[PDB]
Design a binder for this molecule. Structure first.
Ligand SMILES: C[C@H]1Cc2cc(-c3ccnc4ncnn34)ccc2O1
Length: 310
């Protein structure tokens, strides 16, 4: 009394723009990592006043480019232009493990594979796989020629898929610690990669505003492409097996259906400011976006998930 409720959590206003963004797998927590290296965990709620910073930490002294929560919800893993990988505890953001010198170049991309294994990708295209129980990387692959923009995981956890600024989709066999192939290079930098259609399609967003599709186990060349009415796609996240959201340098977040390929419409925008990253809540209800306006914004996915069909 008074309880003031909205349809989404309030915007989170940051002091520096954030490339790192992830939702907790079981709790109403959102993590961000910013261009100064700072990392934050926020509680979020549709009740006004109840979206609050729970902790911040300043262990990285250069840009924190990606963050991810462990599957058990206990740890937050962060990577940085300082070339380090850190393991933090979710409760307080205390540093529990520091893996410095993890790459020879700034780390841009992070993907957790299982409770002991993760992959990192750097600004020169280097890909490494790590088991926390073994010293040194399991794999060191430099077939890519430009930065690793994004990575995705085979549901069977066999293949790691990579999107690179060299215009290629990369395929690595995690189980065999080996390179399989690079796709034919595309005209746009591949900024984003996600699995769609129950793992049967690979969707990659490009710096020219195209989405490329590849068939599963046909990674060598695209099976389809279509363009948005946008100059770029810089980040994507799947909402359903057919629907994903994109963020672009024009600041607009777009809902896009795959096969049939259609722009459903605009979810929202960071007016006139590039969208840097997206994430989806564990419950599926909220999309979060991080923009160059230094805001984390929440969007209700219910209207979409209703309208949406196989
Ligand atoms: C870079 C070093 C440090 C580190 C940490 C982890 C970790 C810890 C906790 N939960 C997790 N879930 C997924 N990976 N993972 C895994 C590998 C690894 O190699």
């Amino acid at each position: 009394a008074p309880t003031r409720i909205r349809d989404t959590p309030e915007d989170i206003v940051l002091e520096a723009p954030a490339s790192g963004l992830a939702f907790h797998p079981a709790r109403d927590l959102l993590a961000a990592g910013d261009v100064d290296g700072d990392v934050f965990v926020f509680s979020y709620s549709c009740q006004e006043g109840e979206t609050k910073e729970l902790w911040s930490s300043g262990h990285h002294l250069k840009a924190c480019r990606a963050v991810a929560f462990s599957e058990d919800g206990q740890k937050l893993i962060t990577v940085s232009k300082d070339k380090a990988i850190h393991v933090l505890d979710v409760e307080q953001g205390q540093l529990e493990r520091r893996v410095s010198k993890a790459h020879g170049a700034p780390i841009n991309s992070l993907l957790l594979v299982d409770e002991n294994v993760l992959a990192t990708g750097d600004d020169t295209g280097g890909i490494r796989l790590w088991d926390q129980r073994k010293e040194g990387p399991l794999m060191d692959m430099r077939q890519h020629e430009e930065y690793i923009a994004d990575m995705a995981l085979d549901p069977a956890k066999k293949l790691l898929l990579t999107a690179s600024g060299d215009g290629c989709l990369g395929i690595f066999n995690i189980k065999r610690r080996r390179f399989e192939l690079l796709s034919e290079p595309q005209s746009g930098d591949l900024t984003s990669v996600t699995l769609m259609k129950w793992g049967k399609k690979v969707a990659c967003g490009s710096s020219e505003g195209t989405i490329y599709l590849f068939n599963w186990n046909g990674f060598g060349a695209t099976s389809d492409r279509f363009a948005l009415r946008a100059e770029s796609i810089d980040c994507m996240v799947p909402v359903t097996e057919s629907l994903l959201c994109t963020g672009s340098t024009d600041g607009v977040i777009r809902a896009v259906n795959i096969l049939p390929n259609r722009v459903v419409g605009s979810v929202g925008q960071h007016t006139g400011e590039p969208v840097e990253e997206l994430a989806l809540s564990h419950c599926g209800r909220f999309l979060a976006s991080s923009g160059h306006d230094q805001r984390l914004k929440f969007w209700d996915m219910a209207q979409l998930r209703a309208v949406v069909v196989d």
